Design a protein around this ligand. Structure first.
Ligand SMILES: Nc1ncnc2c1ncn2[C@@H]1O[C@H](COP(=O)(O)OP(=O)(O)O)[C@@H](O)[C@H]1O
Lengths: 798, 167
């Protein structure tokens, strides 16, 4: 009964904002965890069983609350809503934002009293009530929506504090939904407040949808073909027009200049430049106004510094300069007072207020903002992007921008806090000010951008969905950094053009992302040309396949810079290995280490790998470790160093099979081949035969060997005395480790007996996973310190 | 049980590589750990044996979860008090410190382990190579008293965001 009345009221409320019914383009909604607003809130039992709440998140101005208004007017239009709900309540979090303890709020314009004692009777059985809380970043107070001291009752007729009610009726015993829209920065206040939420990130204006916006805005031939193309021909500002608010800025920032004509594409770089140019388009023909601008500036941000968001019928402005210029600002803004609908005044989207707050902190303690910073981000970003750009626009636009000496005293503290927030702080989700946007909007590119050449500290950023113009603008300027980025899948030259020019000092790793099918085939041209490039390289479990290999075989041949490459867990095992070995064997290469673990490989390729040691004297440490190869490669492993002077220091090896054949092959290389330091055998199903052939192999005098490991065995209680007597006979190894070996009390008894006099090894020993007795453990912990020739012994569990 | 391997293999790999496990991979394993653990506990089944050797993974990245006085032993359990769910939070904290800085927080005998437990000591993670939010999570999951330990329903929805913003 009361449905249609305030349905018509909200129709009047959100119809008047601009229209905005033939001015609505549908947007993109993402939740990966690795959409449609129709049944968005499904608690369906795929992975979201008990949920009653979602949170919307995007950057500053993506269109969350205008999407909410579209939802309200849409259901207020009906629009095929099968009635999951009955009554929906927009809660503007910059009007309810006080602390001063009102009760439940559902009468807004103070009409006749609604049936409120039946308004919660229609919650309990019909759970068809929903409160769109919107604008969490400005729920004022003292940035204090913490864990509630005391709860409220589930009728709310008492005049409890909404700081202790909506927090509680959000938190506990709700039986009613809420879809809070916020910047993700203030998710943390909402995070440890327990919710069991869902999350949706909101991603808007693509190419074709921006085209539909420019058609639905203007008339279809005046400049909808002319301004669209004239803004299209810019290197930025089509990327920047992912944000719909910048589209609103330009379409009503040259609609006033279609009368003057032909000034459209100019001076358009950043998120700062669009705001400053739009403000110049409004505040042009009156500069009188030189005092009005400072009056608007000097009072715009005390509503967040002292936290009073709407300006309260501008009685604050009735203090500071209430004249007809207020009506002029209202008419040129067109959304200050009328959207408050009774008496109050506000800014349009309050990124304007954070922008004028940046003007405030120019023209009025910036370390106070520094300390208060991460509880919110827009004020710092906009003041930085304002700063070097008006240092540039000191000689650009007129000197109304600053009235300076306050400019340098916030750029040098800006790099000071940047140094402070990088060098001992990495926060990845919510504490910003360690992001490259704050240098990006700055570009003066000779000190203040290359000061982060010093404060970089071997970083690595995270490019999952950002337009890559920003980091490519950033790190190609500076000259340090052993960077490890992530997921440059779709876009291409924002990888190429910056990883080419890294010639001062660089390094790279793209591990565990998914480079696409020509993401294999990208980075060829990045690496196939000289200068200075990657020294060593890892590609851990990345998206790679066969088709890359010949490609990177060329970067095998063309490189005098590569020393270590890894293809781990990417299925490169057959016929791409032929391309890899002909690329390596083909030319002289300065390659010293190589890593080929866990790739789906077999014994049908190692015969090629025999040649590369014999030809190349530079390939030295071939960790081929424990990819799925087995027998019949074993004679090729023997011919890997039948000859001496192979120049092979280490050799990581593979989980192998039958003990006699592999260790008989290994005896020849461990006897004949000099300069072979390490040997990591592990996971090898071996018995007495293999270690017997091993100690017969090390019985060969003047065969040199460092550190060796044999892990998986169930050894007889005689081999330990044999090997330790061989090691007292000659310093044949230096250390040894043992793992899951059921070798018993008698083996370690013989071991501490032979270790009592003339400790055989000279570096280290390891025995793990042992449930044996303590009477010998006393001797193990005893005889290690007086003779520290055996330094460390692994103690198993106790 | 899978046939690819285990997590201890995945730490021995980097121990050979002399490189710290990068954070996207850290969270990428940790979230599929936490969701399987909360799926275990929501049907009212405890584990009592949260050990890094008891973590079994395919070569694609899916942790196929293994079924149901050692060194890993909680302060209440090493003083023979109740093995609570806060002991599971303790073992998740020690497991995460192992996957963070390549070894356990307290790594012989068992007196001095209890002594540094009573003194509440552990080596600090470095700042520049792990997220500070992760270190705050670490300090929140190695609290001595059981009532100062947030449960899996907090940490799993923490790590869901930590991973969804590091996909
Ligand atoms: N579907 C749309 N059609 C046209 N303009 C839009 C659309 N969505 C957003 N905009 C632009 O974005 C702005 C509204 O964003 P808003 O919802 O107020 O952001 P927030 O939720 O952060 O306050 C408006 O200025 C409008 O021009």
């Amino acid at each position: 009964i009361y449905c249609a009345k305030y349905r018509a009221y909200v129709r009047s409320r959100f119809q008047c904002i601009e229209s905005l019914n033939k001015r609505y383009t549908r947007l993109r909604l993402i939740k990966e965890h690795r959409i449609k607003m129709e049944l968005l809130f499904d608690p369906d039992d795929e992975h979201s069983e008990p949920v009653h709440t979602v949170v919307f998140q995007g950057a500053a101005g993506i269109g969350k609350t205008i999407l909410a208004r579209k939802m309200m007017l849409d259901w207020a239009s009906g629009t095929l809503y099968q009635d999951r709900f009955d009554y929906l309540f927009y809660i503007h979090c910059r009007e309810v934002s006080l602390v001063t303890q009102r009760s439940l709020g559902d009468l807004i314009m103070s009409c006749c009293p609604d049936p409120n004692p039946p308004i919660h009777k229609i919650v309990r059985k019909p759970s068809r009530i929903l409160f769109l809380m919107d604008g969490f970043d400005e729920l004022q107070g003292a940035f204090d929506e913490h864990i509630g001291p005391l709860c409220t009752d589930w009728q709310k007729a008492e005049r409890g504090d909404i700081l202790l009610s909506s927090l509680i009726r959000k938190k506990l015993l709700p039986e009613a939904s809420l879809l809070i829209t916020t910047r993700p920065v203030a998710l943390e206040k909402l995070q440890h407040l327990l919710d069991h939420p869902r999350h949706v990130e909101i991603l808007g204006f693509s190419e074709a949808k921006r085209k539909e916006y420019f058609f639905k805005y203007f008339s279809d031939e005046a400049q909808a073909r002319a301004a669209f193309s004239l803004i299209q021909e810019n290197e930025v500002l089509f990327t920047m027009c992912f944000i719909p608010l910048v589209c609103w800025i330009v379409c009503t920032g040259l609609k006033q200049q279609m009368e003057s004509g032909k000034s459209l594409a100019q001076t358009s770089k950043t998120t700062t430049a669009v705001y400053v140019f739009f403000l110049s388009s409004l505040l042009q023909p009156r500069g009188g106004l030189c005092a009005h601008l400072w009056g608007l500036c000097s009072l715009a941000a005390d509503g967040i510094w002292n936290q009073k968001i709407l300006f309260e019928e501008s009685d604050l402005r009735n203090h500071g300069l209430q004249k007809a210029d207020v009506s002029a600002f209202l008419r040129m803004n067109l959304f200050q007072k009328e959207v408050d609908c009774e008496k109050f005044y506000s800014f349009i989207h309050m990124t304007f207020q954070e922008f004028f707050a940046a003007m405030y902190y120019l023209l009025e303690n910036v370390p106070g903002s520094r300390l208060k910073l991460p509880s919110r981000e827009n004020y710092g970003k906009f003041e930085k992007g304002y700063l070097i750009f008006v240092v540039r626009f000191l000689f650009g636009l007129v000197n109304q921008e600053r009235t300076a000496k306050a400019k340098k005293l916030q750029i040098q503290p800006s790099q000071l806090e940047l140094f402070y927030c990088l060098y001992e702080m990495q926060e990845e989700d919510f504490v910003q000010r360690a992001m490259d946007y704050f240098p990006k909007i700055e570009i003066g590119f000779l000190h203040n951008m290359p000061k982060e050449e010093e404060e970089e500290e071997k970083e690595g950023r995270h490019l999952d969905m950002v337009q890559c113009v920003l980091p490519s603008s950033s790190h190609a300027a500076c000259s340090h950094g052993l960077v490890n980025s992530h997921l440059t899948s779709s876009f291409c030259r924002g990888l190429f053009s910056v990883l080419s020019t890294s010639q001062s000092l660089t390094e790279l790793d793209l591990s565990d992302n998914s480079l696409g099918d020509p993401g294999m085939r990208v980075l060829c041209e990045t690496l196939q040309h000289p200068g200075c490039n990657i020294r060593r390289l890892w590609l851990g479990r990345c998206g790679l396949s066969h088709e890359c290999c010949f490609d990177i075989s060329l970067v095998l041949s063309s490189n005098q810079k590569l020393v270590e490459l890894d293809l781990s867990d990417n299925a490169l095992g057959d016929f791409g290995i032929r391309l890899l070995c002909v690329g390596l064997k083909h030319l002289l290469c300065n390659l010293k280490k190589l890593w080929l673990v866990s790739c789906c490989l077999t014994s049908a390729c190692c015969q090629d790998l025999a040649s590369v040691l014999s030809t190349s004297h530079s390939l030295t440490r071939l960790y081929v470790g424990e990819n799925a190869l087995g027998d019949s490669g074993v004679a090729i492993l023997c011919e890997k160093a039948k000859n001496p002077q192979c120049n092979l220091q280490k050799l990581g090896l593979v989980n192998s099979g039958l003990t006699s054949v592999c260790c008989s092959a290994l005896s020849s290389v461990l006897s004949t081949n000099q300069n072979l330091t390490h040997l990591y055998l592990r996971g090898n199903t071996l018995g007495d035969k293999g270690i017997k052939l091993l100690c017969e192999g090390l019985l060969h005098p003047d065969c040199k060997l460092q550190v060796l490991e044999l892990d998986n065995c169930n050894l007889t209680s005689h081999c330990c005395w044999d090997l330790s007597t061989l090691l007292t006979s000659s310093q044949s190894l230096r250390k040894l480790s043992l793992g899951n070996n059921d070798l018993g009390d008698l083996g370690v008894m013989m071991f501490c007996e032979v270790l009592k006099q003339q400790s055989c090894l000279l570096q280290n020993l390891g025995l793990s996973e042992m449930y044996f007795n303590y009477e010998t453990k006393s001797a193990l912990e005893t005889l290690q310190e007086e003779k520290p020739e055996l330094t460390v012994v692994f103690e198993p569990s106790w | 049980l899978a046939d690819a391997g285990d997590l201890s293999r995945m730490i021995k790999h980097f121990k050979k590589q002399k490189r710290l496990i990068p954070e996207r991979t850290v969270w990428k394993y940790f979230v599929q750990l936490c969701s399987a653990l909360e799926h275990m506990h929501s049907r009212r089944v405890m584990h009592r044996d949260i050990k890094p050797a008891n973590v079994f993974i395919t070569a694609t990245g899916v942790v196929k979860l293994g079924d149901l006085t050692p060194y890993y032993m909680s302060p209440e359990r090493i003083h023979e008090n109740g093995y609570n769910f806060k002991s599971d939070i303790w073992s998740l904290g020690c497991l995460l410190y192992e996957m963070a800085a390549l070894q356990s927080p307290f790594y012989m005998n068992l007196y001095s382990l209890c002594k540094k437990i009573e003194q509440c000591d552990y080596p600090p993670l470095p700042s520049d190579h792990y997220s500070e939010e992760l270190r705050q999570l670490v300090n929140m999951c190695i609290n001595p008293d059981p009532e100062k330990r947030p449960d899996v329903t907090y940490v799993y929805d923490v790590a869901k965001r930590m991973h969804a913003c590091t996909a």
